[PDB]
Design a protein around this ligand. Structure first.
Ligand code: MN
Length: 222
């Protein structure tokens, strides 16, 4: 499956709108009162105003073509200093056979471009914002990992309950989309920030809709 719509919160609505408009172009953004949406290929993200006293952020990876990694990395570096880990400004993940690069947006969201070497198409054309393919990862940071995994299995997602680690990160998915299911607490790779529970809502290709409440419970909406 793929993510049709992801709803996230932000305490920096105005700066976020300016950042994404400059990055993707007005044609890929739609401003509303107290919220705006951005189009990322077949996926859309709607950023809504956060509650005062909160500064939500998330880890979002965006799929790009198998052959577009260096162009993607160059393009991303135009919007912010590339984040680094172990002093390197990119990573290779053998589990996903993918190359990744990162930048922070105005809210501190960890924005990753992930180029899956065998699980993404080869696009014989120049890379551009119009070549972002879909959302490839989103963190599902929950107060109950076991309960959450059990419910995602119903949402029809591939889940091997016997391998679910309640105190760690769990890669739930296949092909080009993986939900990063885990508890709050640990520092995210490439970031100074640690995983913390913030609300979000997600609508999948299969008509399944879910939400993470402000206390971290994963709930199937439809
Ligand atoms: Mn990632």
């Amino acid at each position: 499956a793929s993510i049709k719509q992801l709803t996230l919160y932000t305490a920096e609505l105005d700066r976020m709108l300016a950042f994404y408009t400059n990055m993707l172009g007005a044609q890929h953004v739609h401003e509303q009162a107290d919220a705006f949406t951005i189009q990322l290929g077949v996926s859309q993200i709607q950023f809504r105003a956060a509650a005062d006293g909160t500064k939500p952020f998330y880890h979002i990876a965006i799929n790009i073509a198998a052959n577009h990694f260096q162009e993607g990395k160059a393009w991303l570096s135009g919007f912010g200093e590339l984040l680094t880990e172990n002093d390197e400004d990119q990573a290779y993940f053998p589990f996903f056979n993918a190359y990744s690069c990162y930048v922070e947006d105005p809210s501190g969201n960890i924005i990753e471009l992930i180029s899956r070497q065998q699980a993404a198409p080869v696009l014989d054309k120049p890379f551009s914002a119009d070549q972002l393919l879909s959302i490839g990862e989103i963190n599902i940071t929950t107060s109950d990992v076991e309960q959450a995994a059990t419910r995602l299995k119903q949402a029809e997602l591939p889940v091997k309950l016997d391998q679910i680690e309640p105190a760690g990160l769990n890669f739930i998915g296949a092909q080009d989309l993986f939900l990063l299911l885990g508890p709050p607490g640990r520092r995210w790779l490439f970031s100074e920030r640690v995983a913390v529970i913030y609300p979000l809502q997600m609508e999948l290709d299969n008509g399944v809709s879910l939400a993470i409440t402000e206390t971290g419970e994963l709930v199937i909406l439809e």
